[PDB]
Every structure is written in C-alpha cells, then in structure tokens.
C-alpha cells in the first residue's frame, strides 16, 4: 500500500484567552493519520500554561505518536502559528528527524511566551482564536 509520508495539520483553538488548563494540564488535538492505511496516528498536545514552574510563562507544544504498527517512526517536524493574515509566524523546527515510539512525544517546552501571545498588537489571536500549524515529514 501507498503511504502518506508528509502531512500538514492545522488546528484552531477557540476562545484561547479563556482556556482553563493549569500548569502541566494538556489540551489534546484530534487524532490525525498518516502512513499506510492510515496506520500512523498522531496528535498535538498544547500546555497553555507550560509543563512545570520553569515553563509556566510559556505555551508548550508537542507532537505525540498515538499509534503505530511496529516499533518506531522517524520524523522531522515544524510548528508555527498562523497569524491574522494566514501567514506562518513564530516557527520552530526539529533539528533533524527524531525517533518516535508509540506514546512518545517531541516538541518545545517553551514554544511561545504567553504574554506575547495574548497581546492583541501581535495579531496571533484574531477573534481570540489560536491557529497552530504542524508540518511533518516521516523519513522511516
């Protein structure tokens, strides 16, 4: 069977300034699929108030391999925010392809400062919506 080997996932979280998650609490995205027969399952994990005390001023963003048929998947990834114009901004990308196993995630604990994100001047929460964009390339 053929495989979806590169995929871009776009997720809008409504009313973001009112998310109620505390530090260490997660918002999980819908599961999205790739690979052969949709057998690689992924989701994005957002911690709106970080993981720990070190990151409580940040939003943390992680890509999680929810399911895979074998042991591992190696993948490169890039996260960004889509601004009020639909353009990518505040991008961060993996240094190389990282080894995912099922239940494992990789990402950025300090992806963006909350006070920058919440400042209307920066155009990152049009209508109080945060739109995240995740581009993945599976190399093995």
Residue numbers in the entry: 26 to 165
Q: What are the paper's exact sentences on this?
A:
We also present, to our knowledge, the first X-ray structure of SPOP-MATH without bound substrate. F102, W131, and F133 are frequently mutated in prostate cancers, which results in reduced affinity of SPOP for substrate proteins. There is no evidence to suggest that global structural changes contribute substantially to the energetics of binding, as comparison between substrate-bound and substrate-unbound SPOP–MATH structures reveals only minor side chain conformational changes upon substrate binding. In the structure of unbound SPOP–MATH, the electron density maps support modeling of Y123 in two different positions, but in substrate-bound structures, the residue instead adopts a single conformation.
